[PDB]
RNA sequence: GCUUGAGUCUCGUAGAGGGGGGUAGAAUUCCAGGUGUAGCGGUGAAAUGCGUAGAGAUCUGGAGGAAUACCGGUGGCGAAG
């Protein structure tokens, strides 16, 4: 439809769920998928396998997309932070740079208290 | 009377010692806008809760508060805090 011919995939991976969204360099989202929405409701959605399933499910259908080269950037503590890439790269888009954001707060915003369980 | 206790004077050193003022980066939250769409979030597992009145994720701009990520150590300073 637009034939971007290049893009970047933002992965937000946490201990609870994984989200993957394809986007343009100018911050324009085309599609997204989540392990929770990929039929892994419960404890499996936090597993690496459900992350790669969502990655490939979001990467599929490249015809209308048109993104040939798809960079990658991950954020947060994921289920290895590598399985999603292992699936996405084989999905068809070659990877040349992966950046990791993982926002590290330089102090401030006192974290929540501890869990006594 | 004396100089060894105590003290003053000259030249230097290290240090989160204390009070006042200024400024910088990261991150959280919130507000406005753009793409986008069915979930998000949380747990041992759930639910409440948020979202089709468009959430979450993502990009641009803005407001404001608080603390200074490594350096950082069987390091330092302070009578103690
Ligand atoms: Mg918590
Ligand atoms: Mg003196």
Swiss-Prot record:
InterPro entries registered for this protein in UniProt: Ribosomal_uS11 (IPR001971), Ribosomal_uS11_bac-type (IPR019981), Ribosomal_uS11_CS (IPR018102), Ribosomal_uS11_sf (IPR036967)
Segments passing through the bilayer: none
Keyword flag Cell inner membrane: no
MF annotations from Gene Ontology: small ribosomal subunit rRNA binding; structural constituent of ribosome
Recorded superkingdom: Bacteria
Keyword RNA-binding on entry: yes
Pfam families assigned to the protein according to its UniProt record, in alphabetical order: Ribosomal_S11
Gene Ontology biological-process annotations: cytoplasmic translation; translation
Quaternary structure (record): Part of the 30S ribosomal subunit. Interacts with proteins uS7 and bS18. Cross-links to IF-3. In stalled ribosomes contacts ribosome rescue factor SmrB.
More about this protein: Has been predicted to contact the N-terminal domain of IF-3 based on footprint studies; exactly how IF-3 interacts with the 30S subunit is controversial.
Functional description taken from the UniProt entry: Located on the platform of the 30S subunit, it bridges several disparate RNA helices of the 16S rRNA. Forms part of the Shine-Dalgarno cleft in the 70S ribosome.
Membership in a protein family: Belongs to the universal ribosomal protein uS11 family.
Entry protein name: Small ribosomal subunit protein uS11
């Amino acid at each position: 439809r637009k034939q971007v011919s290049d893009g970047v995939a933002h992965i937000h991976a946490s201990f609870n769920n994984t989200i993957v969204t394809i986007t343009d360099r100018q911050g324009n989202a085309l599609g997204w998928a989540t392990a929770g929405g990929s039929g892994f409701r419960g404890s499996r959605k936090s597993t690496p396998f459900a992350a790669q399933v969502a990655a490939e499910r979001c990467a599929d259908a490249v015809k209308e997309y048109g993104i040939k080269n798809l960079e990658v950037m991950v954020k947060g503590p994921g289920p290895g932070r590598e399985s999603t890439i292992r699936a996405l790269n084989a999905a068809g888009f070659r990877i040349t740079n992966i950046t990791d954001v993982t926002p590290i707060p330089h102090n401030g915003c006192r974290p929540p208290k501890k869990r006594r369980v």
